[PDB]
Design a protein around this nucleic acid. Structure first.
Lengths: 62, 82, 72, 73, 162, 81, 80, 83, 95
RNA sequence: GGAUUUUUGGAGCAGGGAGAUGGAAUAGGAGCUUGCUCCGUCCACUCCACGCAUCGACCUGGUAUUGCAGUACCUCCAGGAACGGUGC
């Protein structure tokens, strides 16, 4: 019931929009677009596209 | 469109000019959208003025209230239609 | 008798101190304030309680803030 | 576009609550469809009991959210 | 017989006698206390007139509850988790019930909100010092057997049974 | 029956007198606008002359000259001179 | 023209409304009329010093709103 | 156009109603003359001014612009507006 | 309609809202001054009579007292604004 | 059809002072963790000016009424302020 969102599809899509909006409100970058979002959310432990020495790490944790 | 015209006749929490929530079995709309809430009550924050006293709400009921158009901050549904 | 139109037109461009509904007194030359009473000054400085504090200049206020308008 | 019904109350005494918590005690004297009830022999009543006779107050319905009656008219 | 959310949603949730939200389920003999929270935070009174509920138990989390009718029921005991599920509760009218011994008064005292109560027509009634046990265990109570509580009664009820 | 004495009639007679009055405000009954009105229109957005803010509690008066106060933040006035 | 008509370009649109009573909410509103009347849905709302309160069918007013946030995949010139 | 709200106000005028205004000015009494602009004339009312000394005056002119709400006849619940 | 929108362009351009008109024809990032003391900085993408302006690269800041108030700061790029909550719309801030 | 009655908003904000009075286990900085010193968010007690008055409901005991009608709210004395907003 509550385990499936609108587009998520009970296991077809997931909720990356919310963390994306949080990262947008954090970094505020005029080119923080689909490619940057997907690259930050696909990899594991690269040199991250934002400072992990700020609350960006906690936001990634959320 | 007349969006609420589907959600009327049920107990709906209408919001206030000062932040209360008032569950009245809403009736109808307007161009000013002044509310005619039937079987309608209210409840607002009983502010402790402190933290070792906690916050509650004392119960008030008007019954049927003609809330002037300057009132609504929102209109959500808090009771199905009886 | 000097109605809104002639008075605010002879002061539209005269450096006006215009008090807004929160202490804001603009000190500057208005551009135009038509029947919509939308204010807008050119090289006006901010004041709080009559203390010149800000440099934004040509700023365009909604009349909904306007408390008073005078040409200093 | 409809004038207000102060018609039998005109030329009679009302004690009005306008914004700023203020009161104007006076006679109903003049109005417009804008409800701008104008009170002569009208006196202010402040937060404190201080009261000043204002001569002729043309008190706009812009603020005055109340006014009670002194008589039956 | 199955007492469902059928009979809880079809129940009447509207103006009570004292002008509060009451939800009556009269005429079911419902012995099953389940599926109730579907009152949906718009209810304060839960009434089960004509019920056979094996005891006092089976309610959901209602931080709002203001009246409950468990009279004409089969109440034998009194269950534990009543307060956190009824903190706004003052009226839990369980008259015409079958509570027997003061061990059925064990969770009765843990509420901070009980003032308007009724357990009438129970064998706990004509027992000696029964209202004394009640006036000991119920601090904030004001309506007991439809006549006020007394400070003399409270003195008796605290002082006795040390 | 009896005829209407417009608030615009009041403001017009005041302006014709060129008289000095103090005016009330909105949501703050402490401050009064002491000055004279120069002209008018059909809108009753009060224009003023040699006006000053006069505080009740503070007891000060800050003058503007020919000021144009808001029209909706007017309540009434007392003709002081 | 007005930007009320630009906000009329919002249905099945992921928006965020900061309303008049210190409110900030995420919402897919239901339908918006010419006077800004935009009724919320499945919205998580938080007024001044509040919680994430949920409304599955709510009716957010007009002049009692302050700020609106549109989708990110929303072409501005095409929306006005 | 014309408001069934105004029809409700017309069914609420003439008898005991209870208006509630902006700063807490709530007048429970005979809301005699209300015009669709809502400048409600009440008669023989008990108004609180939110002051808890909810005192009884006569023939008050409580504007509806500040009117937060208005408790109307509980007998017209079957109105012709909603039905 | 046609002549009305002609006069409307002339009104937004050669009237008081020249600040937002230049924010639209010049693509300026302009300070919309709220009546509620929440300073949003950004462009003006859609603008009209009543001061209804849609701002891009929007950044909202407030004086948040937890003390000595801090500048609560966030930046939602695209976001709309109606002209009721606005006290001003100023073309040019020093930043 | 954004100007004095409702939908282009007057909204925001801040809780009066102090005592070698105190709590922050998982949460603040520096003196580079522990110890200890000073420092910019509350509540409990106490001093002022229980932040000040009104009224309303209630708890306390005494006290007047035995009565039929659709309620803003109906006893009187006295205490206490557990609760609400109105003027500063």
């Amino acid at each position: 019931l509550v385990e499936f969102t609108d587009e998520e599809g009970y296991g077809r899509y997931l909720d990356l929009h919310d963390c994306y909006l949080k990262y947008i409100n954090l970094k505020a970058s005029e080119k923080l677009d689909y490619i940057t979002y997907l690259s930050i959310f696909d990899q594991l432990f690269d040199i991250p596209k934002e400072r992990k020495n700020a609350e960006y790490k906690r936001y990634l944790e959320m | 469109s007349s969006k609420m015209l589907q959600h009327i006749d049920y107990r709906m929490r209408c919001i206030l000019q000062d932040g209360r929530i008032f569950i009245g079995t809403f009736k109808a709309f307007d161009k000013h959208m002044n509310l005619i809430l039937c079987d309608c009550d209210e409840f607002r924050k009983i502010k402790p003025k402190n933290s070792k006293q906690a916050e509650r709400e004392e119960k008030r009921v008007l019954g049927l209230v003609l809330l002037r158009g300057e009132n609504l901050v929102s209109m959500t549904v808090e009771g199905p239609p009886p | 008798p000097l109605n809104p139109k002639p008075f605010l037109n002879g002061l539209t461009g005269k450096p006006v101190m215009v008090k807004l509904k929160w202490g804001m007194e603009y000190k500057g030359y208005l551009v135009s304030v038509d029947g919509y009473m939308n204010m807008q000054l050119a090289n006006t400085e901010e004041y709080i309680d009559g203390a010149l504090s800000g440099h934004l200049g040509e700023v365009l206020i909604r009349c909904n803030n306007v408390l008073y308008i005078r040409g200093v | 576009a409809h004038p207000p019904e102060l018609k039998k109350f005109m030329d009679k005494k009302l004690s009005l609550k306008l914004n700023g918590g203020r009161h104007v005690q006076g006679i109903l004297r003049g109005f417009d469809p804008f409800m701008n009830l104008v009170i002569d022999e009208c006196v202010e009543m402040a937060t404190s009991g201080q009261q000043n006779n204002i001569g002729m107050v043309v008190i706009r319905g812009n603020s005055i959210i109340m006014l009670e009656a002194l008589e039956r008219v | 017989v199955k007492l469902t959310a059928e009979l809880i949603e079809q129940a009447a949730q509207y103006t009570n006698a004292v002008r509060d939200r009451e939800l009556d389920l009269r005429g079911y003999k419902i012995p099953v206390i389940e599926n109730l929270g579907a009152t949906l935070d718009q209810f304060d009174a839960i009434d089960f007139s004509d019920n056979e509920i094996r005891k006092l138990d089976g309610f959901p989390l209602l931080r709002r509850l203001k009246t409950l009718l468990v009279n004409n029921n089969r109440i034998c005991r009194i269950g534990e988790g009543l307060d956190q599920a009824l903190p706004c509760l003052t009226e839990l009218i369980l008259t015409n019930n079958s509570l027997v011994e003061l061990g059925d008064l064990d969770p009765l005292a843990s509420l901070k909100s009980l003032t308007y109560l009724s357990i009438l027509r129970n064998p706990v009634t004509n027992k000696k010092h029964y209202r004394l046990y009640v006036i000991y265990k119920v601090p904030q109570v004001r309506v007991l057997d439809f006549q006020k509580v007394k400070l003399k009664e409270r003195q008796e009820a605290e002082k006795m049974f040390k | 029956q009896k005829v209407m004495v417009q608030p615009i009639n009041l403001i017009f007679r005041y302006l014709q007198n060129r008289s000095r009055i103090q005016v009330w405000l909105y949501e703050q009954v402490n401050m009064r606008i002491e000055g004279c009105i120069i002209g008018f229109d059909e809108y009753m957005n009060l224009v003023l002359d040699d006006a000053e803010e006069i505080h009740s509690k503070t007891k000060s008066r800050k003058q503007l000259g020919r000021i144009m106060l808001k029209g909706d933040n007017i309540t009434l006035l007392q003709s002081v001179s | 023209m007005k930007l009320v008509r630009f906000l009329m370009k919002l249905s099945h649109e992921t928006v965020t409304i900061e309303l008049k009573n210190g409110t900030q909410v995420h919402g897919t509103i239901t339908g918006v009329d010419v006077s800004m009347n935009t009724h919320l849905k499945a919205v998580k709302m938080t007024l001044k010093n509040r919680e994430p309160v949920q409304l599955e069918t709510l009716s957010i007013r007009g002049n009692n709103i302050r700020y609106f946030i549109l989708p990110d995949s929303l072409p501005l010139d095409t929306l006005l | 156009s014309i408001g069934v709200p105004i029809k409700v106000l017309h069914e609420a005028e003439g008898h005991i109603v209870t208006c509630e205004t902006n700063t807490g000015e709530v007048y429970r009494g005979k809301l005699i003359e209300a015009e669709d602009n809502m400048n409600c004339q009440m008669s023989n009312i008990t108004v609180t001014y939110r002051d808890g000394r909810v005192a009884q005056l006569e023939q008050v002119y409580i504007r509806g612009s500040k009117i937060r709400f208005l408790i109307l006849p509980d007998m017209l619940k079957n109105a012709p507006m909603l039905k | 309609p046609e002549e009305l929108q002609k006069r409307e362009e002339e009104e937004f351009n050669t009237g008081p809202l020249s600040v937002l008109t230049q924010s639209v024809k010049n693509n300026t990032q302009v300070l919309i001054n709220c009546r509620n003391n929440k300073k949003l900085l950004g462009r003006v993408k859609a603008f009209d009579r009543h001061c209804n302006m849609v701002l891009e690269n929007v950044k909202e800041m407030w004086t948040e007292v937890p003390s000595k108030p801090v500048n609560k700061d966030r930046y939602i790029s695209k976001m709309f604004l109606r002209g009721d909550s606005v006290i001003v719309v100023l073309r040019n801030p020093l930043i």
